Every structure is written in structure tokens, then in C-alpha cells.
């Protein structure tokens, strides 16, 4: 008599299928990666500074240096456990300090350089040589505070701030990622650009994007470092900047859910349209899935987890059209490339949203 038993609940079943599995994928079985022990933190910070204040021929492994500092901050065994828990069988290789050779430093000891697996030495000595030449040139020209030196403790966090700026747009295109990273770091990293006026933001951002694309476990390492930093009691200013950029990447890849919440908050009329009303059930199911996954549902597209895609709203064309129209009416949509299934609904929602934004009311 009543159509109350006609009910499927496909999305809950799909989530149950995916989560309730007793088998674990073993990927990257034959590969290896590099970590740096925490006891070398100082001598990585220096290198994190030498990539900054100098103009270098090639910035290939700046991202690997930022990840090495992350390793020192978390520790070797913690980093190994983080990589193992992300689903990778990659085996970490320990960074080793090594005497350069006949080169002798001011302190009378042999100059100890870094040996990072996968990053060849020659690049390291090239970066160090270029930084030393630049610093000698600047001292010759004029006579350098403590905060304009490579030994400054906030240089690794500035490198990781460029890394986090590219991390924010990991669900985006490489060109848009680089453009947004540079155009934000010209404002976000203004102090560091005053202290280090010749640090190359485009190449560092490109290196970080390449690293995040290839070594997908380093996304999980980055997220664990952000969680460790945000749970600290104290920090520097650059560390709080890094945590701000990191938390500005939370809902990455899922702006449709956010704009749907916005459209609900804006009381759009076309949400009550009959084509839309046929679809509120699966939309509520998607948001219920978000609630069920909990706080980790936001880092799905950053981690690049295959489970991301259950949160997609691509099967609600009326809802997506209304949401995109409401976002466009309020000026939110910007240069968003999301497809509009129903152009008529989009235009109507845009018109109503603009009419509401122009008008004002007292409640």
C-alpha cells in the first residue's frame, strides 16, 4: 500500500564494502625513501636556509629537504610508522653525516655534510657552494643580523610554508597551483621575502608539487607533521603560519559540500524546486557519510585516498546546479571550473542570489 519499503541505501552499502575489509594493499614493496634522524635537526635547518637566501641553478630537491626537516621534527621511527600506516611498504633510509674531505671549517673540524638517500651529494655541495658565495658577496658589499642567516631556526618552516601553499591546491591543476602559491606567498611570506629577497618561490613550489605527486606517502607525512605542530603548546610565528595554511587545506577537493551548506544557509528558493526535491535524500546521505567518517573526511582528497569519491555529489545534477548558481550569485564561484548540469537552474539560482545579496533585511 505504502512505498516505505522501497528503499535502497546504496551509499551506506558502498562505504560498508570499502571500510569493512580484512585485506591490506601492499604497494611500493621494492622502493625506498630517505629520513633524517632528529639528532641532525640543526644541520638540516642550515641547509633549509641555504636553499632560501641564494639564487640556485636547480631547485630539484627542495621539497625533499623540507620533508627531511619534517622527519627530524617527528623522528625516524615515527616517520617510518607514518609511512607504513599510510599503506606503503617503503623502507626508510637513514640520512648520514659525512666528512666532505680536505675542506676545513672555522671550528677546526672537518666540514660535515649531509648524505640523503635519493638526493645525490653533488646537488647538496652545489647548493652549499652557491649559498656560501652569495653570503660572502653580501658581507663584502656591506657589513647581516641573526634572522638573515641560514642558521635561523625559522627557515625550514618557511620552506614548508611554500610546501603547504602548494599543498592547499593539490586537488587543482599544476599551473593554477603554482600561480596561487606564488601570488599568495608574495603576501603570506612577506616577512621572509624581506629577510630573504632572492628565494625562488616558483621553483620551490614546483619541487613541492612534484614531490607530492610522486611520493604519495609524503602527503600523509605532511598531514602528520601538521597535526603534530598544531598540537604543540608553543611555537614560532612561521610555525603558526604553517598551521594556518595547513588548516586552509582541510576541505580540499570537497568545495561542493561547503557551497551546499552555504546555499542552505542562504535560504535559496530553488532548493525547493521539484527536480531538486527528488534529490535531497542522496544529498543527506552524502552529508551523513561525511559525519560518519568524521574529522578525517576532510583530508581524503589531500591524502589522495581511493575512498574519496564516495563524497562526490556528481549524481545530484539538480543540487549541483542550484549550489553553483547560488555560489555565482554571491560572487563566491570565482574561476571555478565545476560543470553545470542544468544551465536554467544555474541562471535562476544566480539571479535569486544576486537579488538577495543586493537587498538587505532586518531579522
Amino acid at each position: 500500500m505504502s512505498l516505505q519499503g522501497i528503499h535502497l541505501s546504496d551509499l551506506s552499502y558502498k562505504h560498508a564494502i570499502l571500510k569493512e575489509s580484512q585485506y591490506t594493499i601492499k604497494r611500493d614493496v621494492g622502493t625506498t625513501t630517505a629520513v633524517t634522524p632528529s639528532s641532525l635537526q640543526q644541520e638540516i635547518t642550515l641547509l633549509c636556509g641555504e636553499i632560501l637566501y641564494a639564487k640556485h641553478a636547480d631547485y630539484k630537491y627542495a621539497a625533499e629537504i623540507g620533508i627531511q626537516y619534517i622527519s627530524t621534527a617527528l623522528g625516524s621511527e615515527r616517520v617510518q610508522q607514518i609511512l607504513r600506516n599510510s599503506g606503503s611498504e617503503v623502507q626508510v633510509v637513514l640520512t648520514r653525516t659525512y666528512s666532505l674531505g680536505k675542506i676545513k671549517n672555522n671550528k677546526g673540524e672537518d666540514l660535515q655534510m649531509l648524505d640523503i638517500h635519493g638526493v645525490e651529494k653533488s646537488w647538496v655541495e652545489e647548493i652549499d657552494k652557491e649559498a656560501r658565495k652569495t653570503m660572502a658577496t653580501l658581507l663584502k658589499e656591506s657589513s647581516i643580523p641573526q634572522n638573515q642567516r641560514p642558521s635561523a631556526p625559522d627557515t625550514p618552516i618557511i620552506l614548508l610554508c611554500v610546501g603547504a601553499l602548494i599543498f592547499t591546491k593539490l586537488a587543482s591543476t599544476i599551473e593554477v597551483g603554482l600561480e596561487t602559491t606564488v601570488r599568495r606567498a608574495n603576501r603570506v611570506l612577506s616577512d621572509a621575502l624581506k629577510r630573504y629577497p632572492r628565494m625562488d618561490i616558483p621553483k620551490i613550489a614546483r619541487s613541492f608539487y612534484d614531490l607530492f605527486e610522486q611520493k604519495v606517502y609524503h602527503r600523509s607525512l605532511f598531514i602528520e607533521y601538521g597535526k603534530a605542530l598544531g598540537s604543540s603548546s608553543t611555537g614560532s610565528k612561521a610555525e603558526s603560519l604553517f598551521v594556518n595554511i595547513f588548516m586552509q587545506a582541510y576541505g580540499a577537493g570537497q568545495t561542493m559540500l561547503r557551497w551546499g551548506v552555504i546555499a542552505r544557509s542562504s535560504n535559496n528558493i530553488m532548493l525547493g524546486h521539484v527536480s531538486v526535491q527528488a534529490e535531497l535524500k542522496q544529498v543527506t546521505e552524502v552529508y551523513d557519510l561525511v559525519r560518519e567518517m568524521g574529522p578525517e573526511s576532510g583530508l581524503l582528497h589531500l591524502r589522495q585516498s581511493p575512498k574519496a569519491g564516495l563524497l562526490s555529489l556528481a549524481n545530484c545534477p539538480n543540487f549541483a546546479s542550484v549550489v553553483l548558481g547560488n555560489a555565482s550569485g554571491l560572487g563566491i564561484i570565482g574561476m571555478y571550473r565545476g560543470r553545470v548540469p542544468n544551465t536554467e537552474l544555474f541562471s535562476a539560482a544566480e539571479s535569486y542570489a544576486k537579488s538577495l545579496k543586493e537587498s538587505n533585511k532586518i531579522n
Partner: peptide, 7 residues
């Protein structure tokens, strides 16, 4: 003298 710098 390059490697003799303060750093």
C-alpha cells in the same frame, strides 16, 4: 676562505 665563513 669561503668555507671559513661564520654561517
Amino acid at each position: 676562505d669561503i668555507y671559513q665563513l661564520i654561517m
